[PDB]
Amino acid sequence: NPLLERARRFLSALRHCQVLGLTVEAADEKGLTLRLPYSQAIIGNPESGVVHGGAITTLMDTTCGISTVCVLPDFEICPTLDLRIDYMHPAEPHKDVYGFAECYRVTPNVIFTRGFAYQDDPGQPIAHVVGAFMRM
Amino acid sequence: ENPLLERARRFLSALRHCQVLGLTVEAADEKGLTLRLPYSQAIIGNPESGVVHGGAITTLMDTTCGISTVCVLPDFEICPTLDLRIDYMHPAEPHKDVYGFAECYRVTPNVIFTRGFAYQDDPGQPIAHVVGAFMRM
Amino acid sequence: PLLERARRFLSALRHCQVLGLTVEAADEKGLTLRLPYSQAIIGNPESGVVHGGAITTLMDTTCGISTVCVLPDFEICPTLDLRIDYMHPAEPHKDVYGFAECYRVTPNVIFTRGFAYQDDPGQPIAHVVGAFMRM
Amino acid sequence: NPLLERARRFLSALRHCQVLGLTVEAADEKGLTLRLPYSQAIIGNPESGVVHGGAITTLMDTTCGISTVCVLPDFEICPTLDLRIDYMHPAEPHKDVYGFAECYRVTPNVIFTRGFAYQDDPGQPIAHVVGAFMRM
Ligand SMILES: [Mg+2]
Numbered sequence: 236n237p238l239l240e241r242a243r244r245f246l247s248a249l250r251h252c253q254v255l256g257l258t259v260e261a262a263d264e265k266g267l268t269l270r271l272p273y274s275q276a277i278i279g280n281p282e283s284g285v286v287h288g289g290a291i292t293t294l295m296d297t298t299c300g301i302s303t304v305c306v307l308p309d310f311e312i313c314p315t316l317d318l319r320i321d322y323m324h325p326a327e328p329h330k331d332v333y334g335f336a337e338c339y340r341v342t343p344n345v346i347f348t349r350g351f352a353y354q355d356d357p358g359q360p361i362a363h364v365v366g367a368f369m370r371m
Numbered sequence: 372e373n374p375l376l377e378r379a380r381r382f383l384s385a386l387r388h389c390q391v392l393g394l395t396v397e398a399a400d401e402k403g404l405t406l407r408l409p410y411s412q413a414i415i416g417n418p419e420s421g422v423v424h425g426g427a428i429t430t431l432m433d434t435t436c437g438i439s440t441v442c443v444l445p446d447f448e449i450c451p452t453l454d455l456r457i458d459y460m461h462p463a464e465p466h467k468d469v470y471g472f473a474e475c476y477r478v479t480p481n482v483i484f485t486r487g488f489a490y491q492d493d494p495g496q497p498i499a500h501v502v503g504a505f506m507r508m
Numbered sequence: 509p510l511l512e513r514a515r516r517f518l519s520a521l522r523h524c525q526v527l528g529l530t531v532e533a534a535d536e537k538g539l540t541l542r543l544p545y546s547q548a549i550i551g552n553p554e555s556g557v558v559h560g561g562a563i564t565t566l567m568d569t570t571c572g573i574s575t576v577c578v579l580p581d582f583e584i585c586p587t588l589d590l591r592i593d594y595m596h597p598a599e600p601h602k603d604v605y606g607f608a609e610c611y612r613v614t615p616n617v618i619f620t621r622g623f624a625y626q627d628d629p630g631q632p633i634a635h636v637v638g639a640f641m642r643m
Numbered sequence: 644n645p646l647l648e649r650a651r652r653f654l655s656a657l658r659h660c661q662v663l664g665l666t667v668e669a670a671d672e673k674g675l676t677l678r679l680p681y682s683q684a685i686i687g688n689p690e691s692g693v694v695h696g697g698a699i700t701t702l703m704d705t706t707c708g709i710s711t712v713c714v715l716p717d718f719e720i721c722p723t724l725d726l727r728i729d730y731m732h733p734a735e736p737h738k739d740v741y742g743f744a745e746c747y748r749v750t751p752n753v754i755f756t757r758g759f760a761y762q763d764d765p766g767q768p769i770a771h772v773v774g775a776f777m778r779m
């Protein structure tokens with residue numbers, strides 16, 4: 236609930252994500268979910284359903300990036316140290332893309348996070364992402 | 372150079388969701404591809420402070436690697452990302468444009484592998500190293 | 509049969525030999541190897557602490573050999589890339605299992621993802637992604 | 644000198660590494676060079692002599708790991724947190740493989756390192772590597 240508002244305030248600070256119309260769907264002590272509307276991130280004909288892979292990447296980087304608020308009691312923006320995204324299969328067209336990330340380790344200066352993109356069930360994610368973030 | 376530059380530029384223009392970043396193609400040829408992200412377009416926090424958002428540089432570098440496929444493909448096509456890693460060596464300097472360079476280092480029948488880096492002043496001490504793989508559709 | 513191929517491949521790997529790695533199962537859906545903990549000890553053997561480097565070998569080997577799940581006949585596919593991330597330490601005094609499944613196959617590249625775990629696959633020690641060259 | 648003999652001692656205590664016959668070629672404040680003799684890497688026909696990816700993974704993981712001695716005053720083993728390896732091209736047979744690495748960021752609990760593997764010419768790397776390591 237407070238995380239919900241902090242997550243939203245992180246997000247609204249991001250211009251490129253404004254264009255993409257990302258919204259926060261949920262924010263627990265369990266992690267963070269964001270939503271990418273397919274219509275804001277089309278490559279080519281909007282008639283066809285096709286979401287730019289680069290939008291999904293932004294979604295994931297941002298989800299990891301913001302999920303840091305589930306473990307930082309205060310609000311800060313943690314610069315990126317490392318990021319890997321690996322796509323398992325292409326997105327379905329005409330379907331919103333969700334991202335989930337979840338901090339799995341926290342040290343004095345670094346936060347490690349892991350998540351995935353999916354559409355229907357989290358069971359067969361579009362892609363996996365792992366990132367480390369500096370707090371300094 | 373020119374034909375590959377024209378292609379790279381047309382390619383970039385299709386990426387509408389990030390056109391807000393003001394990304395430009397500086398150079399393209401058989402040996403690789405250079406894009407630029409103007410810093411004013413990616414500030415996080417106060418515009419007075421000139422700090423570039425990390426997620427902007429991801430886009431720059433995802434986009435750079437993707438488009439560098441033009442350097443090896445005979446025909447224009449847009450190649451979906453399969454895998455990307457970006458590893459930041461050191462923080463970007465504030466109030467300075469960020470450049471991305473990439474070069475394809477392996478081409479198979481359906482996959483192109485590419486390596487590059489972000490930097491600001493000179494390529495010598497890059498901000499971040501990047502490797503990605505792309506699907507020839 | 510697929511299983512026999514997995515084992516042949518593993519036996520070629522003359523340098524893992526020290527680790528006592530075995531193939532636990534192998535079907536179309538993927539591959540499970542095993543690292544017995546007595547073969548990867550750091551420090552006092554009575555302390556049963558598994559060396560991280562052994563697990564990295566385990567995961568690398570599992571990915572590299574998982575290519576038998578999709579390849580018609582025996583072939584050793586060179587590494588193109590490896591991504592390994594550790595979620596938490598291994599528990600002492602327990603074997604480590606490695607699982608991997610090919611999730612994409614192109615004419616000359618095979619992409620596999622896997623993880624390492626001890627009791628249940630539930631919360632793996634580590635995640636690994638890899639691509640390998642074929643033909 | 645003192646780094647060199649500390650690097651050698653870190654490496655003597657690894658078993659798999661001794662079967663590979665890994666040695667410390669060079670070590671200073673700059674970073675760490677390890678050697679992998681080709682004979683110990685061969686998979687298959689020894690005359691054909693194809694060097695196994697796995698032996699190079701061990702090489703780099705170990706090089707990255709031990710390079711921490713350049714930045715740690717006292718002896719300690721730092722477990723791998725994450726590793727990335729990307730081959731530019733296959734190793735040549737019948738040539739030893741050298742692994743270099745150098746810490747580029749040090750944090751209270753994390754050391755980040757980067758390096759590469761090569762044979763004759765350090766400017767033609769067969770592979771690139773970055774890893775993060777924990778100090779306990
Ligand atoms: Mg720390």
Ligand SMILES: [Mg+2]
Nearest residue numbers: 479480481616
């Ligand atoms: Mg192919």
